[PDB]
Design a binder for this molecule. Structure first.
Ligand code: ZN
Ligand code: ZN
Lengths: 206, 206
């Protein structure tokens, strides 16, 4: 949930997942940085296609957070924010009210939660002989995409300078563009799910 | 030195450094992947320019190894190799003969050794009022560049598929190209220092 208005032990720890098979200033920096597979194939299963890409998107965000993880600590980022207009909250026990947490605690919990869904055989069948549950796209895929977006939002609004230092602007913008086009093709994310990055999506998408 | 012919605890650990201030198959995969600041500025000090870029190159290699580190363990890569024609060795105590070690042990030792040179005030002055030692370029910069190259060699020859999975082919090729052009401009590396990547350098450089 969304609230709209030298210690290293507690930074985000990356983990790769095995394959399934103000805002105006921020956006101008993003576009200026550049100067320095979406459709379901015919005969292919939609759930499988969406499952494949959901694990792939997790892995791109894992690689991108991992590149800057030493710059995001509970002292640099005491709240999970995407500018001062958006704060994102985490519920530690399911069905309980979400709370304010530092950005790396948030990212850690969220990413480990995604891996727990990928690793759950009743959600993501790990054999050819398994099936997907009813409501898979709405009940599993959509919540995962909505949450992974919040990680992109924190990176762009609070760590873009570091991404630029490492020359990862094009990899970041390419991943995000593919994430947003994929969500559009299947109506997984709507304009409101983009929060502070709406203009970015308007520019990058096309 | 050069010899020419589920446990996770022992993979390479990344650490960012604060800013100073067969082979034919491998090369064709590299070029096909693409379809899916060098001169000293006027009035500027050469030692400073080379010191700045040496820490920057370390940081690009750190980010690139970090992206694939879970795929390089003492079981996947029991020797530090760049194809079966080149094995690179590490001396654990200075002045002693270098030995065979696993790739991630090698990379760990080498990168931590680079940081120890960057952090040594008598080599890399950490204030405006320090000076560089005599022989800086030959005795400090050149050995560091020669060693960092061996890390690029292992990545290209043994982990390129994983770099491709993460869409980092262009970032890898861009870093390596800039590394090789920088070495050419100042004669830091010679054609022999490139070992198995000579053809790659021939294609990428220009
Ligand atoms: Zn942060
Ligand atoms: Zn390896």
């Amino acid at each position: 949930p969304v609230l709209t208005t030298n210690v290293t032990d507690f930074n985000y720890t990356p983990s790769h997942q095995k394959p399934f098979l103000d805002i105006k200033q921020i956006v101008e920096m993003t576009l200026g940085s550049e100067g320095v597979a979406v459709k379901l194939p015919r005969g292919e299963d939609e759930n499988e296609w969406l499952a494949v890409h959901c694990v792939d998107f997790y892995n791109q965000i894992n690689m991108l957070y991992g590149s800057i993880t030493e710059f995001c600590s509970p002292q640099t980022c005491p709240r999970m924010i995407a500018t001062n207009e958006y704060e994102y909250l985490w519920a530690f026990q399911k069905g309980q009210p979400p709370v304010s947490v530092s950005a790396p605690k948030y990212v850690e919990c969220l990413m480990r939660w995604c891996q727990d869904q990928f690793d759950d055989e009743s959600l993501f069948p790990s054999k050819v002989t398994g099936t997907f549950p009813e409501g898979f796209i709405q009940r599993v895929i959509q919540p995962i995409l909505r949450r992974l977006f919040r990680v992109y939002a924190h990176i762009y609004c609070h760590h873009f300078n570091e991404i630029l230092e490492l020359n990862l602007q094009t990899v970041l913008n390419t991943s995000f563009r593919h994430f947003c086009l994929f969500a559009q093709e299947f109506e997984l994310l709507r304009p409101a799910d983009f929060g502070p990055l709406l203009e970015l999506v308007m520019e990058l998408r096309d």
